[PDB]
Each structure stands twice: as C-alpha cells, then as structure tokens.
Design a binder for these strands. Structure first.
Ligand SMILES: [Zn+2]
Length: 433
RNA sequence: CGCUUCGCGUUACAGUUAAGGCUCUAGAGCCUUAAUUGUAAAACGCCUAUACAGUGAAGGGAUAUACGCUUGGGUUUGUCCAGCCUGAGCCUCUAUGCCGGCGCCUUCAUCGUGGGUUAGGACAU
C-alpha cells in the first residue's frame, strides 16, 4: 500500500494530506495555522536586552566614575563631584549612535537628538566642571576615558551568519560587500555580449568611480530594469547582508548533492511536525512529497525544506515535487491558487501526495506604584487609550484630556499637552484596575 | 535569530516651584495634581573567585587575533536547543572596527571585587 504523505508549506498556513496511491484514495486531509507571533516576540527580546544592557553599562560607568573620583579625593559632597556625576547619567551621542523602518528609526533619532547633546557637550561641561574644581589636567583626562569608554565590545561585523545552499558545503557565505567581483560577474554571465565586454563591464561596475561607462553601456545595450537595479546596487556599495551562498558556488550551483535556521521558521516547522506526529499514530506513510514555499528543473533545496526533511526522518523517501506538475494538476482538476486560502493548501497537499496519471478519473475520496493601597501608574497622554480615561486620578487634567479627545477628537501641541522643558508630552497618574 | 549605545518612559527616596483646597490662629501646617532637579532599581535566580574591571610598562597586530571553523563550559532547567558570553590548539570557511591612536599576550602592585546570562523554540509534566 503506497500511503504517501504530502505537505504543502505556505508562509502562514500549511496543508497536510495522506493519499493511498491505489485508486488515488485520500485517507487524511487537514490544514494547520502556523505561529506568526515569534518574530515580534524576538524583537521584544532584542529591545529588552538592549535596554537591560544599556542600564548595566550605565551602572558600570557610574561605579567606575564614583571609584575614580573618590580615589582622587573628590568625595560625594564635592561640588566638583556632583557636577561630574550628574553629567555621567547623560553623556550624549558620540556621532556613533524597508523605507518604513528607516523612516520610523529616523524619527526616534531626531526625537533623541531634540532632547540630548553630543558627547563633546557633556565632555566640555565636565571640563568646565573640573577646570574650576582644581583637578589639574591628568585627572580630567582620566575621566574622559570613562565617559568615552565602551564597556561591552561592539561586535557586529560577522554576526548574521548564513551557510551555503548546495548542501555539500555548509561553509560560511561571505558578505555581499566583500565578493562584489564574484557578484557582478554573476550578473554578466547571462549577458549577450563578448567576454572582453564582460570584463570591461566588470571593471566599470566594480567601483573605481566609473559609473559613466556603466550608464553608457546600459543606454547602448538592451538590459532589463531589474538587472539594472541589481548592477547599480552592486556599484553603489549599497549591498546589505551576506552573499547568495558561497564563493565557489556563486557561479556554479546547478547540481544538487541544517542546525541554523530562522526560529520563527523552526517553530512553524515543528508545529507542522506536531500535527504530522498526530498523522503518524494511525497512518504509516511509506513516502513523503513536500513542497515548502511562501505564498528535475527545480532550484536548490530550501533551508526550511531541508530542516523539515531531516526532522521528518528523525520523527525514508522524502521528495520535493516540482511546481510545474503541481500547478498543472491543480487548475486542471478544478479551481485555481489563492494566496492565504487554507482549502487551497489542503487540496495542494492532496494533489502533492496523489498518484498522477495523464490523459480526471483517479482522484477520489514597567513598574507600578502601590501607595495608599491603590495602584496608580503614570501614563503619557499618547499612551492613554479611549474608554479608560476615567482611571486618571488627576481631576485637573481629566476634563482637559477628554475634551481634547472630543473637541479635537502634534495634536498634543495643538491641545497644549507639550508643557515640559523640551516640550515633551506630560504624563498623568492612572488608577490601574 | 544577532552587537551596541543615545535616549524616552516607569517605580522608590529626597528636595524645589506652580495651582485647588482642609486644619490651627494676614500668617502656619499638610492633602491632591502637574512641572523640575538629584540618586537608585528594572528580573528572580544560576554560574564565575582558577573569574572580572582599573592602573603603568615592555610584546604581536593581514606568517597578531577572533564576532570565523571543531569540541566543550555557563546561562541550562525535567530534557534538548536558539541567542549571548567564554576555554582550548585550530586558520579551511567568515573580516576587518578608528584617525601610530581600539581591541589582544604575558607580566609586579590587583590594595582590588568584579564578570556572563536572564522569562525564547520544542517534548514530557
Ligand atoms: Zn557552496
């Protein structure tokens, strides 16, 4: 009995099916929803880790400055100590601190810039502080090595690590800005020009400030706009992330032959395997046809596909059907493909595990306050949500808040809630229920 | 998946200022709410003492070194991991921070007591 389990893996939903290949009977067919909340949770972890390690570095800098200043005779009371210890909590940026994310971060930088200073300002301020406090010059020079000190090393050059795709080498892929010579040529191999012209284009695009010859060639030669964009991405050194798999396999990857993967992808695959282990109990599948996508003559094995095959063998022929046959037998057996349809995923899993014939008669079936016994935490006017405006303890600003959220239904500056030193939004105490 | 500060915000304490009042007899005190200044905390825990930071000097720095490879250790638990930190030869793969000046290797004095991780993915319960 050829019980073949077919798994169609989308970016969000996943279809599972088990098709007895005699008479193309279907013994199991199901859909499953994958966890899409893991990347945001990891982003929350990254933000929390950055906050905690910034606080820890602040503690280390404060302890070091306190120890040094008490060593050179500047006790806590010293008017020369309090000024320097006050500027230690606010040392400022040392000029060392897709479009939506850029726009978003750009605003917070300006937000930080509108209410902070440059390292040089806090430093010239500790200068004037210790130049009238009789600190000679060496001691002021030694507190500049505490203000302008990095405690945890900033190591970001070789962190995002990707292995190769061809599966017989899992070596470290280089960054896109290191193997540009192997990158640009990967474009020009599929070009209808002479090899000498290929080398001339290599020399022109590969920096050397010779983009005018690149533009002249591109005006002269008929070349696609996406290839135009890729070449100009190579030439302008705007490349980000690692290269598309290792150097010896950039130019040759037409032959076939995984502990590292995205943890969101890993937990999606494990959820699918959790459902698979609920298929495994009552069905012994002798073969597995899997096509893992987003939504022969195929491309290389996907990292999620490879991890899925390895974990399926751990929990056996596990093949990957081409998209041509699956797409053909799909619409030809009725209906078409819909992105985000769970039924479509289930029926693609049914088709994937089915024994194909040829010429339609086979496929059957933040801390809080605890004063006076009542909880009252402070929330900014931006952080106060509608419906819960009555929890504000401040009766002086309660009417003002509700009126602004009704009369006016930037708005805070219009409503006059930017009353601070740097015109920041004020915060009100709200009674937590 | 990740490094890193700049902040913002929260809580706790100690002050100051501005309103809106309760009590004593124009004044005094404290009640709330805003703003402002200063300090501290932001996991608990686990693991470091053979570890970690500072100080000054000789040493290497594209035939150093490691964020790179192999194998461990901490986090690490009921169990396995991810990430981060790190030991040890490793240099095959990964690559270079800054304008000799950063990191690194020992070394006295190290009096020091400091350091890493920290609620995320699965199974069982
Ligand atoms: Zn390769």
């Amino acid at each position: 009995r050829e019980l073949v389990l077919g798994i169609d893996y989308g970016g969000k939903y996943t279809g599972l099916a088990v098709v007895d290949r005699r008479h193309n009977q279907v013994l199991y067919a199901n859909r499953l929803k994958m966890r899409d909340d893991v990347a945001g949770i990891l982003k929350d972890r990254r933000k929390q880790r950055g906050i905690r390690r910034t606080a820890q570095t602040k503690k280390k800098r404060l302890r070091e400055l306190k120890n040094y200043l008490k060593s050179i005779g500047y006790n806590e009371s010293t008017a020369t100590f309090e000024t320097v210890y006050s500027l230690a909590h606010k040392r400022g940026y040392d000029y060392a601190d897709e479009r939506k994310q850029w726009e978003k971060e750009k605003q917070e930088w300006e937000e930080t810039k509108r209410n902070s200073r440059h390292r040089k300002e806090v430093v010239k301020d500790v200068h004037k502080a210790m130049i009238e406090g009789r600190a000679t010059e060496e001691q002021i020079k030694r507190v500049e090595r505490i203000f302008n000190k990095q405690y945890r090393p900033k190591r970001f050059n070789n962190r995002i690590l990707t292995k190769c795709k061809v599966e017989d080498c899992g070596v470290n892929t280089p960054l896109r800005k290191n193997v540009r010579d192997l990158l640009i040529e990967n474009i020009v191999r599929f070009f209808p020009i002479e090899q000498s012209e290929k080398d001339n284009l290599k020399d022109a695009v590969l920096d050397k400030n010779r983009r005018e010859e690149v533009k002249s060639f591109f005006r002269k030669h008929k070349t696609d706009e996406h290839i135009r964009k890729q070449v100009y991405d190579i030439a302008d050194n705007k490349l980000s992330g690692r290269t598309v798999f290792c150097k010896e396999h950039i130019l040759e990857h037409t032959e076939h032959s995984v502990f590292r993967l995205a943890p969101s992808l890993k937990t999606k695959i494990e959820n699918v395997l959790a459902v698979i282990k609920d298929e495994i109990l009552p069905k012994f599948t002798v073969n597995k046809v899997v096509m893992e996508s987003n939504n022969k003559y195929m491309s290389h094995a996907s990292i999620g596909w490879r991890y899925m095959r390895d974990r399926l063998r751990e929990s056996l022929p596990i093949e990957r059907q081409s998209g041509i046959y699956t797409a053909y037998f799909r619409r030809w057996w009725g209906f078409k493909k819909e992105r985000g349809n769970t039924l479509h995923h289930a029926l693609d899993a049914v088709i994937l595990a089915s024994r194909k014939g040829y010429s339609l008669v086979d496929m059957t079936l933040n801390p809080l306050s605890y004063k006076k016994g009542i909880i009252t935490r402070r929330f900014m006017v931006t952080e106060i949500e509608c419906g819960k405006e009555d929890d504000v303890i401040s009766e002086t600003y309660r009417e003002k808040l509700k009126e602004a959220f009704k009369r006016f239904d930037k708005e805070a500056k219009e409503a006059g809630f930017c009353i601070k030193k740097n015109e920041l939004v004020m915060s009100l105490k709200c009674s937590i229920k």
